[model samples]
Target: EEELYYGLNLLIPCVLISALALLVFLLPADSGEKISLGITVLLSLTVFMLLVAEIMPSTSDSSPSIAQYFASTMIIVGLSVVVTVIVLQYHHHDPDGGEGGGEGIDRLCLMAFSVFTIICTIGILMSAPNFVEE
Candidate 1:
């Protein structure tokens, strides 16, 4: 049970930090802080991963669950940064958005966010512990 507690403690922070990155994507393009905020959280995840690594074992080729959580968080954070950049790019190029050939920046952001959320939800469900575990 002690090991469970430690893992939960580590994972909780990682999940929460990654959720912050999700929030960055939800921010309005006019917010003007999306890029900076996304970058800050991404760096924070790296820092947290390093700090946690000091406590995690290094002998095993396969890392602990906490490490996996950090890795997942980093991937999301990086994507959040990219999404923010894309939103900014579209906003700058065509403030009116869409009506050219593709969807507007705002609409595209919503669709991308929706798809991302669905995938993340599926990932969470798939990763959950099974009733019949070894």
Candidate 2:
């Protein structure tokens, strides 16, 4: 029972963090808070990753589902940050510098990240055999 609660504690926050990552695109590029939110979400995921590492036994024969979830989530968050940087760069560039496409890119990223996070969260969590005890 204790172990189950602990895992839930880890998982719920991670899902919420991923949801927060998706919101980065909703903010206007001119607000200057877009990248900051992405970075903060990425940092929060890192902290959760560290917590996961400390709780798992060092010699486990198989990688746990929670670990898989955390790793993938962190990667998703990190990539979002990178994409945010690119979007911001394009936003700040001169208008006359060729055909501008940052808005399209932003929409693409918003959809991609949203789909990835949804699939990752549901797929991985559903695959965990021990997530619900018999």
Candidate 3:
């Protein structure tokens, strides 16, 4: 149970992230349904990847590439999936057609949110202190 706690702890952010995306993408079903569908799928994929990566062997000389690949792939795949869906989701609504709008405020806020999430995920990974330890 104790060990299970840590594993789930590691997954908490991912769960929150999944929820946030769901809120943004699903709350507005009419406007964001497609995006909601996309994000839901992507986040589910993320959950799978994260869980699998946790079980898989860590990076080492023998298959350093494999570990690196999965790590990179998980993050990149997640980012790509999220960004693509959001962009497409907003594209139809934005007068600029996803180019963003006159108000720098919203864009700024959006950027801030993205950076915050990325940094937070980094922080979560860093909590391990020694990546090689994991």
Candidate 4:
């Protein structure tokens, strides 16, 4: 019971920090802070990962649930930074080329990350052993 609560405490913050990565899409291209915000969130996730690692036990047998969640969240956040770079690259290209594809790329990535984050969070949390013990 105590262990469950401790893990839950760590899990919730990591989940929330990952969700913040989606906000990078909401910022206007002119703001020039999209990458900044994404990186900030990524850094926060790293801090939490370090925190979890410090408390997590080292065992060859199996991994901890919160560690799995942290790793997946970091991957999602890191990929979001990559996507931000791609979107910015598209945004900075020669406008006279005419058929601009930046908007489509932005929307596609937003949807993809959103769905992936949700599914990753729920799937991993639910898969934990005796997650909701009575």
- Encode model 2's per-residue lDDT on 20-134: one tens digit a residue: 6545454453455675666677677678778887665457465565576667766766776786677676667433333333466767767776677567656755676354642
Q: What pairs collide in candidate 1?
A: none
Estimate the TM-score of every prediction: 0.50, 0.65, 0.32, 0.62
lDDT (0 to 1) per candidate: 0.55, 0.63, 0.51, 0.62
Give lDDT tens digits, candidate 1, residues 1-134. Answer: 54446656655765565455444444453445665666666676678778767765567554464455556656764765676577567555434343332345545544664556456545644675443432
Q: Tens digits of per-residue lDDT for model 4 on 1-134?
A: 66667767865765565455444454344355665766677677678678777766567646576567667666765775786677676666433332323456667767876677567656755786464632
In what order do the candidates fall by TM-score, top score first? 2, 4, 1, 3
TM-score of 4: 0.62
- Per-residue lDDT of model 3, residues 28-117, tens digit only: 333555555566656666676666566665556343422354365456545655554565556554332333233343344445556555
**Which is the leading candidate under lDDT?**
2
- Inter-residue clash pairs, candidate 4: none
Q: What is the lDDT ranking, best to worst?
A: 2, 4, 1, 3
Per-residue lDDT, model 2, residue 72, is 70
RMSD of 2: 5.4
